[PDB]
Design a protein around this nucleic acid. Sequence first.
DNA 1: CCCGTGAGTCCG
DNA 2: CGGACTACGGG
Lengths: 245, 245
Amino acid sequence: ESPADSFLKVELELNLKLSNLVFQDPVQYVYNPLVYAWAPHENYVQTYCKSKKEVLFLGMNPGPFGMAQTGVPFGEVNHVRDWLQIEGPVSKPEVEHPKRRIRGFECPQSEVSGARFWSLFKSLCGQPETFFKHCFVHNHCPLIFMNHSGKNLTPTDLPKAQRDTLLEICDEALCQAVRVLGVKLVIGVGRFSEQRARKALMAEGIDVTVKGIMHPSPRNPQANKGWEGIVRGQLLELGVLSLLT
Amino acid sequence: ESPADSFLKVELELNLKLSNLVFQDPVQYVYNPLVYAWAPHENYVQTYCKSKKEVLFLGMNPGPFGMAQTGVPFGEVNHVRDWLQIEGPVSKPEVEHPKRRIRGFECPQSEVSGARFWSLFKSLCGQPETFFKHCFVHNHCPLIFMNHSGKNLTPTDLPKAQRDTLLEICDEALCQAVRVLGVKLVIGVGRFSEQRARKALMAEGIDVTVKGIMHPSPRNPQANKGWEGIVRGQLLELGVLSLLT
DNA sequence: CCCGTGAGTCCG
DNA sequence: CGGACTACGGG
């Protein structure tokens, strides 16, 4: 029937476990847009997760100008507002670094990764209902981390102690999400997410295939030479273009 | 028109924004004399801000025995009581460091910076009404900060993240203050206020010139000999001695 | 207090 | 490998 409500419950219980973790060392700021940007996030799930899915795209964690602002995965402001047509009130984290303030849908910066991601599907699928008929998008981890100067820290940059515990907790929620959605294929966006999903799903004995595509980050020089062209070819090879229409 | 009421409204708006800030790290104590010494401050503004001004002298923030006690900029107790003839009730900060309790007009210590500053204008102008005809005095930031041992931390001493948050808020209040007072010349007292004011006011394109004089602090080795003589020379060069007499 | 030296970060 | 921007100790 509709996985939306259960998906949101997975996420709220995940938030509960993450709220009791204590980060140290180089980590000096932690944001969770599933707290302060819950409203647009809930709107995204209720609008686009009304039925069981064939394919899940999985990213690592929010980027600073995307999901950190909008609550939506790969959630670059223009594409979220104008194509996905998702809105909602956004408040702020308890402790903000001044170079990484949350302005929500008034953030003037584009998250390049997110702009690339949604531009691909806007071009391929035309309308959002066409993409979400059989697909969904989610991140392994909802937290974003920064050091003293506001520089982003990936989950892999974290001290080994906190890193392993964080990711194990996230593995467990990912497994629940995969089952709630009923997906037969998980596509990891980037190597970290592809490899982490394969490992997490194997550790709980779920027989869902896991593949990957190239991540759109402009820190990847390959992605700056024609990301969209590369990933169209990769999606053709995975045999999912018919689902995407 | 008198800008006094408009100026006080700018300060009250600033206090509201500052009251929501949370400091940490080496900051252990934060006093705002525009809360606990609002009465003498409002007396100061209502008495000496009765018309628009040509010149604004701008300090950085309060010193522990001056404005932190009296609520008046560069507000050394004797010169505030005897030359400015400003008094009023002073309460206390919510949490005091035991070596920096607020005694208000009973504070027995002299703030050297403030004594130097107001003694200069007492000698030059004679009566305060002569000084304030075309001039006014204000600080960029009304807060004073102490570490665990009660040592003063200037805004420059704060960690970058805390400093940037605070000073962006103060910059915007400064633009508003300059507008309501009609000031054509801001004189930064010290290089920090001069440079900060120039950047803030040029960013908003305010029609105002920014210059500087030497800071009178005893921590400034250049001020140890002949501060008054040096600054008289600087004031002469800035063209303001005619307005001040 | 002011400056001179210099290290963290960005170059999507 | 360069160039610009912007913590802290001595004076």
